[PDB]
Each structure stands twice: as C-alpha cells, then as structure tokens.
A = this chain, B = another copy of it.
C-alpha cells in the first residue's frame, strides 16, 4: 500500500500478512454476502493496483465469480481508453505520464509506474479507480448470488418478528437497487409477508408506524 512516513512523504509499504489473511478468511466465511464489499474497501485502503490484484488473486474458491470480475474490469478498462484516449504527449518532458486501462488494472504497468501516478501532484489515483471497477464487479456478484427474491421472504409461523425483519432487510440490502427508494418494499410487502398474528397487531397499529414501533408491538409475538 501507500502510506505516509514520518517525514511526510508518501511511500510504498508491503501489504501486511494480517491483511492478506483477513481478506482470504472473509471470503471463506462470508462468501459474497453484501457485508464483504465494505470490508474489501476498508482492507484495500491505500492499495496500489498490484495490491488489489494480489487480494483478488489470493482467493482460492469462487473462481466463477472471479472470472466475472475480470470481465467487468475489462469492460471498464475499455471504456476508460475510449473516454480518455489521452494519446497525446512527448516522452522527453520531465513529467512521465501514460495511464491506460490496462495500466490502471496493473496488467501493463510496473509497480514503480503505479506509485508514480498515485504519488504525483496532481495525483492520478489508479488505485482508487481500479478499486471502483473491482467493487462494481463485486456489486454485480452478490446480486446474482442473492439466494431469494424479496417477494419470497415471508415471516415463518413461529419466527420472531425480529428474525423475519432481519431477513427482510438483508435480502433488500443484497440487490440494493433504488436504495431508500424501496419504501419498505412499497410498505405493503413488509406487513403482507408478516405472520397472521403479527399482522393483526401491525394492522391495528395504524398509519404512521415506525420500524421501532412495529418491532416493539410484535415483541413476544412468538417463540
């Protein structure tokens, strides 16, 4: 990664063994549950493109998803070259530049070139750009790997309302299209998929009920 040293200069530092194990383990234990993605973003803080590729390459299973990630990265790299042809420049002027899609992804760039772009003034943040592409790819997965449609999440006969509500918003988080435009899945779906007994309590609650008010009302509704 790139960190600041006490002298105030931005310097490269090797990716830590703790970090490497942390990413591998999060994938092994959580697979592609949505909470994985914020951890990747946090664990890849300051990463060069090489480091990001290292993190993705150290994943052993889930090779179907990783191939999908390569396609998404490749689509984004091509769009970069088309939108940023920046093919104009002279080699001799003291300021070496040349970011391309494959260079941002670490395929055609050396580590030193990656550090050069990231530590320039102004900086060309090839690490953050590549991380954007990787997260977009991870975002498409998880959506694909969401096992259930929100329409098929229904409170079990004996399921405590809290456990059903947890499942409801977990599924909503995966496939988080139109975030905060879900409107309780049009309001109708949270209640309609509720248990018979809970619904009567929730129905009796009336207009303007908060999630807090609904969950308290349905506390002790079942085992």
Residues of A within 8 A of B (CB): 1, 3-9, 11-22, 30, 33-35, 38-39, 41-43, 45-46, 54, 57-64, 66-68, 70-72, 140, 144-145, 162, 165-166, 168-170, 172-173, 179-180, 182, 210-212, 215-216, 219
Contact = CB atoms under 8 A, between A and B. Distances in A.
A8 B8 contact: no
Q: How many copies does the complex hold?
A: 6
Contact of A41 (B16, B54, B59, B63): B54
B17 A11 contact: no
B179 A64 contact: no
Nearest to A62: B166
24 contacts: A1-B14, A3-B14, A4-B5, A6-B6, A7-B7, A7-B8, A8-B9, A17-B18, A17-B19, A21-B22, A35-B59, A38-B57, A38-B58, A61-B166, A62-B166, A63-B166, A64-B162, A70-B179, A71-B210, A71-B211, A72-B212, A144-B212, A144-B215, A144-B216
A151 B39 CA distance: 37
Contacts of A5: 4, 6, 8
A70 B59 CA distance: 27
A85 to B, nearest CB: 23
Contacts of A3: 13-14
Contact of A17 (B22, B46, B68, B144): B22
Contacts of A170: 61, 63
Contact of A4 (B12, B70, B210): B12
Contacts of A68: 210-212, 215
